Amino acid sequence: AKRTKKVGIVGKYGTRYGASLRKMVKKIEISQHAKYTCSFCGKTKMKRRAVGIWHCGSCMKTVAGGAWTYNTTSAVTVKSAIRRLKELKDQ
Amino acid sequence: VQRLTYRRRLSYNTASNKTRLSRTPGNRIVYLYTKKVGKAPKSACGVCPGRLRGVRAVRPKVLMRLSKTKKHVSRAYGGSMCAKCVRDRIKRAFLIEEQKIVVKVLKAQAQSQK
Amino acid sequence: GKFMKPGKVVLVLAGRYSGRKAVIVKNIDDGTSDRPYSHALVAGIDRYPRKVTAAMGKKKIAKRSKIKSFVKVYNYNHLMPTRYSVDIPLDKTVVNKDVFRDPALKRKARREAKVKFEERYKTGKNKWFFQKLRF
Amino acid sequence: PRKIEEIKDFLLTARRKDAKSVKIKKNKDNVKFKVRCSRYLYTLVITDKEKAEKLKQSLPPGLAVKELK
Amino acid sequence: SINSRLQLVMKSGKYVLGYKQTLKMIRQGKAKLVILANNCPALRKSEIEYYAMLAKTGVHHYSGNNIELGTACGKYYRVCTLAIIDPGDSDIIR
RNA sequence: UGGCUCUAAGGGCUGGGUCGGUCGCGGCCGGCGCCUAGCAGCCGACUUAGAACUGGUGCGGACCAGGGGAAUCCGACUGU
RNA sequence: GAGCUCUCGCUGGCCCUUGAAAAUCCGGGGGAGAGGGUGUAAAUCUCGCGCCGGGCCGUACCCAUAUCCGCAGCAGGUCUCC
RNA sequence: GCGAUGGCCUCCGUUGCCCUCGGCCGAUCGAAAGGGAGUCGGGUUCAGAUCCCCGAAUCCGGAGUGGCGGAGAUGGGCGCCGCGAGGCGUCCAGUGCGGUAACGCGACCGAUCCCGGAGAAGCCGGCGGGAGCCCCGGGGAGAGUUCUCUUUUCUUUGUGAA
Ligand SMILES: [Zn+2]
Ligand SMILES: [Zn+2]
């Protein structure tokens, strides 16, 4: 809040595009541009290369994830369900 | 100030029409058409961003004129793969072969027990 | 305990002989004031014998059963130890650290290592050491 | 062109069958001998003057050693 | 828990942090225990396991990743593989 | 808001291993000073602020170079 | 000398945009196969030289308030470099 | 592998047959600004000159007999002769060498097959290196002013590809 009160990243859009639309965009704009922690090296190098594809600067590992987030809640849920079904089937 | 023109008929400034300034013994600045900057071969691993060392970065058709020693390095996978990934491949191959031998021994022991 | 012994076999991970199998003939692992890092003098094989397949004969079998050896000092970080060990004599009078200063002495060491490796390749002993690493 | 550091190498180059006119240029302590060949013009730079004068007499076959002036 | 034993080792015992130094210590034969994080590269993990098999040294696979291993060891950086040479008064070695 | 005369501030490079011994001002060795508050010399691109004096109150002196405010209707806007 | 232009090299930001194909050249894994047998040879992705050849078509000028298109030596239009 | 001619039917080339091997992916056209190996300097005509002349290069293709040198190269052991250097007979190895390493040395056998790289890459911002031009303090050469001043102001003060 040093410079802007409640816009931050969406301050580049200025007065345009509507306050509610900018507020809705802000979450995605922060999430896609935020660098995550790579769970291969432990470094904060996971950067969104393109839509749904993330790249590690150090590991050079490319992971197919969400469009704006590294891991989506739907992906986590489906992974857990698939693991549970695999364990149930194999016993 | 001496203003200079193109010495060819390609007036458009394109990739093939790049020039540089050069001073002649006649004491007049002229244009010399420079060749494109070649890049050294990249590692076949596909993981290391850096390019291979010990090899000249020149055009592929100039690689034909270049001698054999300039186009590679004296090593296994020399001039085609980086030393780091080469040694990683060596140790990975050794460890996988040892693990396969161990698995085969365990399977034989299980067959003998059964 | 320590497992870098003059009977051990190592895989060279760097240099011109990358991927070659060698037998340690000397280990230092303390320093020399000229080679401070822990190291070991080894004798390896530059060229592995080719397959025979028994549909070969005599002269061609002899031609195939050829070994090109080398003698080299390597850092411990450039060697890959293994379970296997080769009980090759490799008389220390010829293979030493002084051969690396005189080309003739290194030539004699290479010749001696080649002779010993060729005479041990036959009889079907330590056949894993005489097979090139597929990587 | 190629510069030659040895007078013996220069003589060997000038003794070639394909060799031709070898000119001498006195360049005020930078005297040079330039021998023309099929591919390269081989140059030899002599700092000494008496050495160049002696080398002037080393042409075997009576070539085109005519000087430059 | 392994975290308390690791803390006691760091406070009193002798430890080596890293991969190259740990491998050199194992080769020299001084390292008595090795600890590998779960997020360790598989190639490095197999290399360490083979070295410890040759040197007759125990290996423990830490539950946490390299960051958690560093936090448990008390270092603000991240350590993937750890060597324990001589613990002071802990029972980290069985 | 001009002109002229000044002031202050914003920097780089080199230099002490000096005393003794020894070898050919230069090199080596020993304990020294260790500028550890830095000083001495040599160079260089522009600025910013301030002060006085002065011109017939003229000074972004030619050129470049936004007229603003209170409201209504329509279209969000950019664009076509 | 944040001086103008060109070039090279690092470093970043943007995409619900991810930003070309092929001719051609080169490197690497393998040893199918060749060599002479103790002074020589097969090979030289030819190391330094030496010999021969490279055929066909355009090549002037204007490129714009007069050499182009607008009925014209038309205040119009026409893609670039210094 | 078989058959035949040709040329010192030694040796090689050629075609004919047989055996053998073989993925490609669509014939062809499609850019004088895309990719695309390799030429620059000086001189020269009334009018053309990276094209002509001179001087330096470079790329591709050919090179059978291979035109030369050099790398595969002239090592060790055994038994003799010889004071010695050295010479003879016999067993052999010898598709190179060095550096811990990144890698290097003028070469340094190699097929069908397979993998990879270059070709082959958007827009914008910042910084740094190099060059061309501009600037200043001077040396020279030629020069305008000099009714007064101005160590004066104006032009020039270089090197190609490989
Ligand atoms: Zn990572
Ligand atoms: Zn790699």
Side-chain angles (χ1 to χ4, degrees):
Chain A
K2 172 184 175 58
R3 321 188 199 95
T4 60
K5 295 176 57 182
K6 51 183 176 59
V7 271
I9 184 58
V10 297
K12 53 183 178 180
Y13 299 143
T15 69
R16 299 153 293 184
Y17 311 146
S20 180
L21 290 188
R22 286 188 281 102
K23 180 187 184 65
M24 180 181 302
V25 165
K26 184 194 308 179
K27 290 177 53 59
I28 282 82
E29 200 78 7
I30 293 180
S31 180
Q32 68 176 87
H33 298 147
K35 287 179 289 297
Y36 294 83
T37 63
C38 170
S39 61
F40 299 92
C41 66
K43 310 177 186 179
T44 64
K45 299 297 298 181
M46 274 299 182
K47 180 180 176 301
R48 173 248 180 92
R49 168 173 291 178
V51 206
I53 151 181
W54 299 71
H55 186 63
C56 175
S58 57
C59 284
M60 291 301 174
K61 289 291 182 300
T62 304
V63 179
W68 326 109
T69 61
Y70 182 81
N71 289 327
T72 55
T73 170
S74 182
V76 179
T77 301
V78 65
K79 186 176 184 179
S80 299
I82 287 308
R83 196 271 312 273
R84 180 185 65 90
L85 291 179
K86 171 80 171 303
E87 298 301 83
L88 175 138
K89 172 185 176 62
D90 288 12
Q91 295 296 333
Chain B
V1 178
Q2 175 71 13
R3 289 176 291 186
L4 27 73
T5 78
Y6 277 116
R7 304 208 297 178
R8 305 202 178 118
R9 292 185 175 273
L10 219 181
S11 56
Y12 308 100
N13 175 84
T14 61
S16 177
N17 202 25
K18 293 305 178 62
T19 62
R20 85 167 193 268
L21 291 314
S22 66
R23 185 172 294 102
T24 66
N27 203 332
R28 45 174 167 265
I29 307 299
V30 304
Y31 264 159
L32 283 183
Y33 294 83
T34 55
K35 317 298 174 55
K36 293 186 177 182
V37 178
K39 288 184 293 297
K42 196 171 75 279
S43 179
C45 60
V47 301
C48 303
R51 295 187 173 274
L52 265 30
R53 300 145 296 273
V55 290
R56 283 185 56 89
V58 86
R59 310 304 293 183
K61 222 163 300 181
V62 190
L63 292 175
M64 177 182 181
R65 329 199 304 258
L66 288 190
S67 62
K68 180 56 173 299
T69 59
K70 304 173 184 179
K71 298 177 295 181
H72 76 151
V73 69
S74 58
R75 198 228 324 278
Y77 295 81
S80 181
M81 187 173 296
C82 44
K84 162 184 173 58
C85 281
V86 161
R87 68 166 61 93
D88 290 330
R89 278 176 167 258
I90 295 173
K91 58 185 58 180
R92 171 181 287 100
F94 167 78
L95 294 173
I96 297 278
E97 290 184 12
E98 292 282 5
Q99 268 291 340
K100 288 184 179 182
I101 265 62
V102 170
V103 170
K104 190 173 183 180
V105 171
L106 292 183
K107 185 177 181 179
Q109 289 187 356
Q111 190 276 339
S112 300
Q113 291 169 344
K114 291 179 173 297
Chain C
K2 293 176 293 299
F3 57 94
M4 307 300 295
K5 302 201 62 56
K8 266 294 188 302
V9 182
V10 293
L11 309 180
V12 191
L13 302 177
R16 182 163 56 95
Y17 304 102
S18 301
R20 299 300 192 276
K21 303 185 175 180
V23 183
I24 301 182
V25 76
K26 186 71 62 58
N27 58 275
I28 284 80
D29 72 273
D30 69 304
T32 333
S33 72
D34 311 326
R35 190 169 298 270
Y37 59 89
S38 301
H39 60 275
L41 207 177
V42 305
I45 43 191
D46 178 71
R47 194 180 309 166
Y48 296 80
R50 301 182 182 181
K51 189 168 58 178
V52 46
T53 71
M56 197 123 296
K58 288 281 190 174
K59 286 182 169 297
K60 195 180 180 181
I61 278 194
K63 200 67 167 297
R64 291 291 194 86
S65 59
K66 246 58 180 300
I67 290 183
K68 183 178 181 299
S69 60
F70 66 93
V71 41
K72 206 71 172 60
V73 177
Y74 288 112
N75 184 16
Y76 273 172
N77 299 88
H78 306 157
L79 295 177
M80 179 60 180
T82 184
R83 304 149 40 185
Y84 309 93
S85 62
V86 175
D87 187 72
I88 185 76
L90 284 185
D91 46 84
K92 299 165 55 183
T93 57
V94 177
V95 276
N96 255 12
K97 298 181 85 289
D98 299 73
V99 305
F100 296 90
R101 307 203 311 265
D102 196 319
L105 275 66
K106 196 166 181 180
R107 186 107 50 86
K108 183 63 60 59
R110 184 186 296 103
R111 232 297 202 188
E112 176 70 282
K114 174 181 187 301
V115 170
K116 305 304 277 298
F117 292 157
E118 282 186 351
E119 75 168 337
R120 197 173 182 86
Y121 168 70
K122 307 178 182 301
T123 68
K125 295 181 73 277
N126 302 121
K127 258 180 291 184
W128 181 91
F129 174 74
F130 299 98
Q131 293 180 352
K132 58 168 56 182
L133 185 60
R134 294 288 294 178
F135 65 96
Chain D
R2 303 303 176 92
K3 190 177 63 178
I4 305 181
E5 281 69 281
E6 179 78 348
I7 175 179
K8 306 303 178 299
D9 295 336
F10 171 79
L11 291 177
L12 293 181
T13 301
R15 214 179 307 271
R16 292 182 185 181
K17 197 271 298 180
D18 73 315
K20 49 187 58 182
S21 59
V22 42
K23 41 197 58 180
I24 309 178
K25 177 60 176 59
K26 188 181 67 64
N27 203 20
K28 193 174 60 181
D29 104 305
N30 202 335
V31 58
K32 307 181 187 62
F33 304 85
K34 311 117 170 297
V35 46
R36 171 103 287 265
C37 296
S38 178
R39 184 173 171 91
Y40 293 111
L41 174 68
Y42 295 86
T43 312
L44 172 69
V45 173
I46 304 298
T47 304
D48 304 64
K49 294 297 180 55
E50 46 173 308
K51 188 171 302 179
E53 289 272 84
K54 179 182 180 181
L55 183 56
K56 281 175 171 289
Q57 304 181 0
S58 300
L59 282 308
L63 216 49
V65 80
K66 146 255 178 182
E67 297 78 4
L68 306 169
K69 194 62 248 177
Chain E
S1 61
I2 313 100
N3 300 21
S4 181
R5 309 175 187 270
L6 279 180
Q7 183 173 354
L8 192 49
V9 169
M10 299 303 160
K11 199 269 298 301
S12 57
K14 296 184 59 181
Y15 57 95
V16 167
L17 300 173
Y19 172 73
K20 188 183 307 179
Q21 201 174 359
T22 295
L23 194 66
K24 290 183 294 183
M25 201 64 58
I26 295 173
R27 209 179 304 103
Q28 195 65 25
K30 301 179 181 301
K32 295 183 184 178
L33 182 57
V34 193
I35 297 185
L36 300 176
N38 74 273
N39 71 325
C40 181
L43 183 271
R44 293 239 298 262
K45 180 188 307 300
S46 300
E47 175 75 73
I48 291 300
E49 288 179 3
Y50 196 81
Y51 254 75
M53 172 185 177
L54 293 185
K56 300 183 178 181
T57 303
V59 182
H60 178 255
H61 294 174
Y62 188 71
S63 301
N65 53 280
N66 51 332
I67 303 177
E68 302 185 25
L69 183 61
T71 303
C73 296
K75 305 300 181 179
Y76 293 91
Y77 46 90
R78 27 180 169 81
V79 51
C80 181
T81 159
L82 156 70
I84 295 180
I85 300 177
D86 192 310
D89 288 319
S90 62
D91 197 71
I92 190 59
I93 299 179
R94 312 298 168 85

